[PDB]
């Protein structure tokens with residue numbers, strides 16, 4: 001599913017991401033835009049052989065099991081394919097574990113490079129939440 005900006009903002013808000021670990025909703029919408037272009041089916045393969053999955057591009061090296069990343073962890077205890085669902089619950093629940101692990105949203109390279117330090121409130125402007 002390819003979300004609309006305000007549609008995804010509302011879905012993330014109802015799943016508890018607004019101000020989660022101090023990150024306002026615009027940060028999460030901005031990260032999703034640049035990680036996946038709002039597409040739950042996005043996948044991208046990394047140089048180490050791991051793959052990133054879903055709207056928040058969660059990495060199989062640490063967070064999910066895809067059966068082809070040897071020696072990797074599955075810290076969210078989910079198959080990576082569950083992160084590609086039109087229902088963002090599994091991606092949100094895993095993202096909450098990632099953002100809580102000490103490095104905040106810096107785990108998302110596109111957030112660090114394209115959202116951090118910008119007016120992220122602009123990503124939720126006009127939306128009915």
Ligand SMILES: [Cl-]
Nearest residue numbers: 024025026121
């Ligand atoms: Cl915001």
Ligand SMILES: [Cl-]
Nearest residue numbers: 067068069070
């Ligand atoms: Cl594996």
Ligand SMILES: [Cl-]
Nearest residue numbers: 011087088089
């Ligand atoms: Cl959803």
Ligand SMILES: [Cl-]
Nearest residue numbers: 021103104105
């Ligand atoms: Cl933080």
Ligand code: NA
Nearest residue numbers: 060064072073
């Ligand atoms: Na894994």
